[PDB]
Design a protein around this nucleic acid. Structure first.
Ligand code: ANP
Ligand code: ANP
Ligand code: MG
Ligand code: MG
Lengths: 246, 239
RNA sequence: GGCCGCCGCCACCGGGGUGGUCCCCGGGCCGGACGAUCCGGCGCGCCCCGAGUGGGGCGCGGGGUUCAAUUCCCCGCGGCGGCCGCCA
RNA sequence: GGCCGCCGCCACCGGGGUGGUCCCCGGGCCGGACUUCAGAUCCGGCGCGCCCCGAGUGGGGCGCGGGGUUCAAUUCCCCGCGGCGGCCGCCA
């Protein structure tokens, strides 16, 4: 069906650009997609202020969440922390939708250069620190491993990428658990095991004979799971008797 | 406090531009303000589709709503219908905040000119019809009356506008027994008048009789409906 | 990136049990005796034996307890995860 | 923009009620009743208009937009004037 696309990468690596191109392709593919990012709101404020961020984070997540109920969502954001990427995944987990992390990278070189061409709104010094404190996706959690790693300096086959994503959208997202396909059959197993250990201690057996006692139980148990009705007490005696006449 | 500023005007009249300016000024005035408009989300879609509108509307209102809890909010939208403007007011009504409608005007001429300059993404034909069906703010409801009417063709004193708004933000947003005796006695009198067909002079007395009785009772502290109503009926029968 | 938790380190995969030199359930695969069925088996390393096919022995991160450790204790490696680090 | 509607025209202001000649509740003011002052108390009252009497100061008549159902209209109905709203129309 539809899925959540999480982007991750340092400022200026080309995330927003990426989003719009990827978004157009996906459209041509008859896929309703929307690009959401914290900036949408953050930049709706004439000025920036630390106190705004709480609201911004909350407002952004709400959009993604409500948007993910009906459309493909490409999250255009830094997500330089893994716990952020997690938060975004829990949204897809919540609506049981497939999710794909796309990590865009580029050498600090290209980043500093592009930031200078932007007026250096964000001090080069910051860009440098972020590059260092950035959480390499996949390095800590397997759920964090990137479905793709894109190098914005080289070409990009948006058609191939769109193809791969669509195919993953069709897969089954197993976020938590499943079952595929008793007590008495089990109690006989456990008990016979203890009985065999008792017999082995009372006869001070050697390696050779013990292996027969073990095979003796194996044969015994096989003969029993063939019989329909069985009683713990009864069987356990037939076993002890079998061991005594060994 | 903080208030909800509603913008209204045809596409290209200068709404978004207006918002950014008004927001900057309000900022220097130590006021936390945010600019929100349906376009924010609509344009987050690579292409446009009728079915997106529902989400776009709902998602936008949610933002304005959650934003108006902590910040001033300038709604940058066309809102060419009054029912739309109302729906935004209901938000301010909900949080009991002041609201100010700002109508941006411009001759069809300036609009068509500006639309051409934008690539005419919106066919001129459309701009023309929207102009012909733009609900003139105030024309139907007093609550719709514009706090201001701005002509984007002439200059704009953002400092003056900012001052007026601030001042309006400070204004205040607006948004038994004795009775039962009166009612019943009235009924009793109508009943008595039906069962005896009195004369003009006579009924005038019955009415003055109730008048005097009622006055005598509003003097007594404790009273019981059932009880007094009986004393009245008895007084009626003994006259 | 910091803190902490669960698990694996018995050897086809998954799940589970267990002081027995492993075992049970499901799946897969291989071989032998007879075509389905019956029976046996399954990884890596090292060593011995056989002209060869093949057969057999030893071991399974380090150490402790024990007749015996996959299991129980301490340590080491690894797998997975949780919380938080939040325009940067 | 389309469709539907509410309130006032009882009379200090606002809300409301009720076929009883009006009233109920809150506000404001004026005055009477207990003051040097001030938070308070109970109680009478409060608008508009046309005509007349004060040979002086005040009081008297009647009406409360037009008509109808009525013994009685503030109330119920039709219209007028005055004030206000609801739903919907939705990139456009
Ligand atoms: N594939 C690309 N190759 C070269 N330059 C690119 C590419 N994509 C984007 N750019 C340019 O790199 C600069 C930043 O791109 P942008 O998409 O804004 O990055 P971003 O990560 O979204 N930035 P930010 O939102 O601040 O984190 C602009 O000059 C883009 O035009
Ligand atoms: N005060 C102004 N005087 C003259 N031109 C203006 C003014 N304000 C804005 N413009 C120009 O008018 C064009 C559109 O302005 P814009 O602010 O986008 O209007 P809008 O109503 O927000 N448009 P839309 O979002 O499509 O409804 C741009 O060229 C603006 O620069
Ligand atoms: Mg960006
Ligand atoms: Mg605009």
């Amino acid at each position: 069906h539809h899925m959540l696309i999480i982007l991750t990468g340092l400022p200026g690596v080309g995330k927003s650009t990426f989003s719009k191109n990827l978004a157009k392709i996906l459209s041509k593919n008859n896929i309703d997609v929307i690009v959401l990012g914290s900036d949408l709101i953050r930049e709706s404020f004439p000025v920036w202020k630390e106190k705004y961020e709480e609201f911004i984070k909350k407002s952004t997540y709400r959009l993604i969440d409500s948007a993910l109920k009906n459309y493909w969502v490409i999250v255009d954001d830094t997500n330089y922390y893994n716990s952020m990427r997690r938060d975004l995944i829990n949204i897809a987990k919540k609506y049981n939708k497939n999710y794909a992390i796309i990590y865009l990278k580029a050498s600090l070189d290209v980043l500093i250069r592009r930031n200078i061409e932007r007026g250096e709104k964000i001090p080069n010094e910051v860009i440098k620190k972020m590059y260092e404190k950035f959480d390499e996706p996949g390095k800590k959690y397997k759920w964090d491993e990137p479905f793709l790693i894109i190098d914005t300096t080289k070409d990009i086959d948006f058609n191939e990428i769109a193809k791969k994503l669509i195919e993953k959208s069709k897969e089954i997202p197993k976020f938590y658990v499943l079952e595929e396909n008793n007590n008495i059959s089990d109690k006989i197993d456990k008990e016979t095991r203890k009985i065999v250990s008792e017999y082995i201690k009372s006869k001070k057996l050697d390696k050779d004979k013990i292996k027969e006692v073990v095979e003796l139980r194996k044969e015994f148990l096989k003969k029993i799971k063939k019989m329909e009705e069985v009683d713990a007490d009864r069987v356990l005696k037939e076993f002890k008797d079998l061991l005594n006449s060994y």
